């Protein structure tokens, strides 16, 4: 078997597995007034873009032409999304960890009390 | 409603204090630096907004931020300005002008419901109070000033026709505020001042407070010594506390003979241990104890003294022959000069501390520790055998 | 720290105790045997010791034996055996009602409760079903006896009458303990649940369902203990974990495992000694002292032979343990606290003692559990240390892998 | 009544944390694709030679790869348009709904990615500035007035040259197919170990795995006495006498403790 | 204190007998020997005459007999699984006669492989399915046929056939 054939099979298994997990995740989100934490929404949105940039890097490479083998655009987008997650979100949420745990703890006790 | 809550606070506030009831109320209400905190049980929504009874009440007074120029002028003149007890006291004792500039809060009073004492509510309140000033209680939801009586109203009113009424409930803020609502003031340390007792010291010791000053003259009314302990909040420079803690320990060790001889060996030992905890607070190795040098050992003890010690460790000598060397050995051990090689148990530390520093007799320690004199002498001998072996290893 | 074994079997496990003494008779020429120090004469049961308890007066000790089943009472002042009293059947549990040795209640294995007085056996009574534990309430003056049945039988010494037994939801109570300051009661059921009862009324205040994320296998609550302060509670699970609970909260403050997977027999709070945040947890194999708040091992006592019980003389560093061997091991930790008053000069001879010495700090896995936990790939690495049939592991890392598996 | 909002806030926080874990699971599955992708050829000639090795099978795999890749990303953009819509990240609801309904091409799918990233950038600035002010006010830094989070992001994005080099580091030592042939033929302008074409996010991937692992850890018949006889037994009668003082705690304290065992605007 | 006299008991008619004499030494009993699995501890008891009895207070090995193949091997005892008289003895791991215990299968397995040259001619090597299953498990069910409290041994035999099926139902 050719090396490309084995490699392409691995991508096929990865892509279908990712799609199935995406199918589950979207369905759970679609099932979900409740207002969310803007930081953690930005945290969720930021790394989602990082996955897209990683997938764009996969897409650029997968093309047989390979006009941009370095995937500069996919890199820059991944670079942006990685930076916000690490340098911006993490210091803030660390300051916010104490209060965030307090609220999540509060509901669990209410949930146990309700049951 | 406010009066009912105020009565509940003051009963808790007045729960344990010695007859100085009246004036403090005028201090709480009028004084600007003073702030009041209350620990309340969980609020049942089914109660329709009824006030729960306070478990713990803490009164803090903001202190510090004194201009360095004012400190120098007053210190030279020897005049103590009203308020700011801890900043003035530390500056006088340590002659440090930087400390007075630091912003801090003094815990004026902490009171817990006596029926509920020792259940850990007081420790909880301090922990929350420290977290509050550390900035952890940030607002998670995405004004409280009141208009004063204007001069126009004062000029337009006639004495006979004055309608002096309670302020409208709409203008007033809520009686109880969440910590997140009101931002804290920036503080560098938390300070306490109290008479040193085993119970109170253990309470503050467990709350990460470090002793910095102990008054030599006992208070006439209580017979207790005023002790000032400091706590540094996270993210703020902590070196200055370590230097003060080291100096206090040296002062304490030498002063055990003069005026703290009355203190029990266990109480004195605990005070040293609490101060050492400040050194563990500093992860830096810049300020460290220095192990005894051979040249410095020679100066302290002549070769005959070392020979005399070894004979006693071998039981070839009487206890009295070595009585002269004990206080110097105590200073070296409790000064941490001997290092990791030599370590002693709590009882052995009490025995060495009593003979070496308090200068108590061996029989007196036997009574205090509820040990026979035979055990006390034997345990003391084991201390010197360890100490002697250390000197041999250095040599 | 340092642990000194004042008495016990200095010989290893495979060596049998009985041969050693005959060979010791041949080796009587040895100077060390002549210079040996025995704290208490005749401090050894014929073949093994079941239970040992120190009188609240502090001047006496009592213990129970294997064959012929008997009760030994030791006088510390005379450092010897006051008397030995044979019994019709072996002893499961017992308590000393008086401050001295005079009055005690003994729960035999033949379903009978025997009341021992100064002169001899005062009275013997039989409960409906086999008992496993016993406790006595001073205020209510009632003796509570667990049993194989669900009922927790109640006997009143003042009225000399059996009374209504408390009905536990589960079948069986492995251990029963009473809280002196509070009066609460605990019962260790066979299922992973502890039921709390009130002696004032007769009502089940609540139950705790012990939760073990690390181990999913079933387990029993072998032992329970109440701290002196009264707001803290200790449990022992048959799988080999110890839970410390603050009674007001419903979650375990700390879960520390002994590591050998054996049952936890006894839990003692070393509040008297100083630095009250120390606790003792005992298996058959090992009994370890560790810090209450943080779970750091202070010291460890590994006798060669199994441990049936451990008892601490209050206010002192000395511990007595009832073992499977002929001698009853006693351990002295000078750091923990001073030696008892009665053996005052034990401190002077600390050098001569054995000064016995890792097992307590680290966890141990069986070979079968390694395969289930997918730890086979680790085998041959520094992270785990080989001990006999199984391989040791770090406590935290075991929790992560068992959560993974 | 404030407790309910305190609760509903907790559920919203909790949902997102599950959404956090699920997306990282998506990343975990995609990890082998990124590793495999980095092993693919880099030039037209190398790709053609790779196909020449097995023309029929490679063509079939390429068609399936293209189909799955297009279907996966089109759904991902659909999830994005819905996701940034629900969280108020995008304000134009009608435009978002139209984008979801319409089927998009690869070039169009690229355009939505650019638009979504641009919108996310604007939301990022507003959120970071807003909450940095909150944390500053909460900690007393407002009284003091340690850079703003948005400013730190801008500065690190300004230091773009340094951070590409981090991505270009070949920690895994991945050699793409026909890399040596492309190097020898001079088909790789950027090169003419740090490889511009091999992308490495191993440290970031491991950091995420460690965070997820830690979070899971932290969150994680009468005869023989067989019947009971209640008649008085004389020998043990008055064996022991009750203590009159009673329990150390007062009954009112006992009643309270047992109850809680095991768990003008005033406010 | 333990006695075997019948004088304390009621007569057949139901009359309550009065004490006829004191307890004698020719009608005595001794405390039960609660044998348990562990390091071997045995106590010699001087009985009537010069004779002696051995009190196995603890015993961890026993000579167990595979009757079908007519062999006996010394094996370690793992634990008591079932006792017909009382389940408390099962709970406490007390060894007495008729107790069903679990024993190591290593010596028996080695003997079978050595004799028949087959891992556990083919007809002879064939054994019951249940016994083979136990061998696969690593522990064999056996019944104690000795009286440990009298002879100081824990000898027994491997369960087979109807006995094995019956006890397996009981388990």
UniProtKB/Swiss-Prot annotation, chain A:
Q: Which domain of life is it from?
A: Eukaryota
Protein purpose: Component of the U3 small nucleolar ribonucleoprotein. Required for the early cleavages at sites A0, A1 and A2 of the pre-ribosomal RNA. Participates in ribosome biogenesis.
The scientific name of the source species is: Saccharomyces cerevisiae (strain ATCC 204508 / S288c) (Baker's yeast)
Q: Which residues cross the membrane?
A: none
Q: What is this protein called?
A: U3 small nucleolar ribonucleoprotein protein LCP5
- Point out residues bearing the modification N-acetylserine: 2
Annotated localization? Nucleus, Nucleolus
Q: Which residues of the full protein are shown?
A: 1 to 136 of 357
Q: What else is known?
A: Present with 1430 molecules/cell in log phase SD medium.
UniProtKB/Swiss-Prot annotation, chain B:
Residues that bind acetyl-CoA, according to the entry? Answer: 110-112, 117-123, 206
What's the subunit arrangement here? Interacts with TAN1. Associates with 90S pre-ribosomal particles.
Q: Where is the N-acetyltransferase domain?
A: 38-173
Q: Which residues of the full protein are shown?
A: 529 to 928 of 1056
The gene name on file is KRE33
Q: What is this protein called?
A: RNA cytidine acetyltransferase
| Compartment(s) | Nucleus, Nucleolus
Q: Could you name the domain of life of the organism this protein comes from?
A: Eukaryota
Family according to the record: Belongs to the RNA cytidine acetyltransferase family. NAT10 subfamily.
Curated annotation (Swiss-Prot), chain D:
Describe what upregulates or represses it: Up-regulated during cold stress and following nutrient replenishment by dilution of cells fron exhausted to fresh minimal medium.
Q: Where in the cell is it found?
A: Nucleus, Nucleolus
Print the keywords alphabetically. Answer: Coiled coil, ER-Golgi transport, Nucleus, Phosphoprotein, Protein transport, Transport
The biological processes this protein is annotated with in GO are: maturation of SSU-rRNA from tricistronic rRNA transcript (SSU-rRNA, 5.8S rRNA, LSU-rRNA); protein transport; rRNA processing; vesicle-mediated transport
Q: Does DNA repair appear among the keywords?
A: no
Other information: Present with 15400 molecules/cell in log phase SD medium.
* Family of this protein: Belongs to the AATF family.
Say what the protein does.
Involved in endoplasmic reticulum to Golgi transport. Involved in a protein-transport step blocked by brefeldin A, which disrupts the Golgi apparatus and its incoming protein flux. May also be involved for mass growth or cell proliferation.
Q: What is this protein called?
A: Protein BFR2
* Source species: Saccharomyces cerevisiae (strain ATCC 204508 / S288c) (Baker's yeast)
Taxonomic placement: Eukaryota, Fungi, Dikarya, Ascomycota, Saccharomycotina
First-to-last residue of the parent protein present: 167 to 533 of 534
From Swiss-Prot, chain E:
Q: How does it assemble?
A: Component of the small ribosomal subunit (SSU). Mature yeast ribosomes consist of a small (40S) and a large (60S) subunit. The 40S small subunit contains 1 molecule of ribosomal RNA (18S rRNA) and 33 different proteins (encoded by 57 genes). The large 60S subunit contains 3 rRNA molecules (25S, 5.8S and 5S rRNA) and 46 different proteins (encoded by 81 genes).
Q: Which residues carry this modification: Phosphoserine?
A: 65, 68, 72, 85, 129-130, 133, 136
Q: Which domain of life is it from?
A: Eukaryota
Q: Which residues are annotated as modified residue Phosphothreonine in the UniProt record?
A: 61, 106
The protein in question is named Small ribosomal subunit protein eS8A
Please state which protein family the record places this protein in: Belongs to the eukaryotic ribosomal protein eS8 family.
Q: What does this protein do?
A: Component of the ribosome, a large ribonucleoprotein complex responsible for the synthesis of proteins in the cell. The small ribosomal subunit (SSU) binds messenger RNAs (mRNAs) and translates the encoded message by selecting cognate aminoacyl-transfer RNA (tRNA) molecules. The large subunit (LSU) contains the ribosomal catalytic site termed the peptidyl transferase center (PTC), which catalyzes the formation of peptide bonds, thereby polymerizing the amino acids delivered by tRNAs into a polypeptide chain.
Q: Which UniProt keywords apply?
A: Cytoplasm, Phosphoprotein, Ribonucleoprotein, Ribosomal protein
Q: Which gene encodes it?
A: RPS8A
Add the further remark from the entry.
Present with 15900 molecules/cell in log phase SD medium.
Q: Does the keyword Membrane apply?
A: no
Subcellular location(s) per record: Cytoplasm
**Family annotation (InterPro entries):** Ribosomal_eS8, Ribosomal_eS8_CS, Ribosomal_protein_eS8_euk, Ribosomal_Se8/biogenesis_NSA2
Q: Where is this region: Disordered?
A: 1-30
Transmembrane residue ranges: none
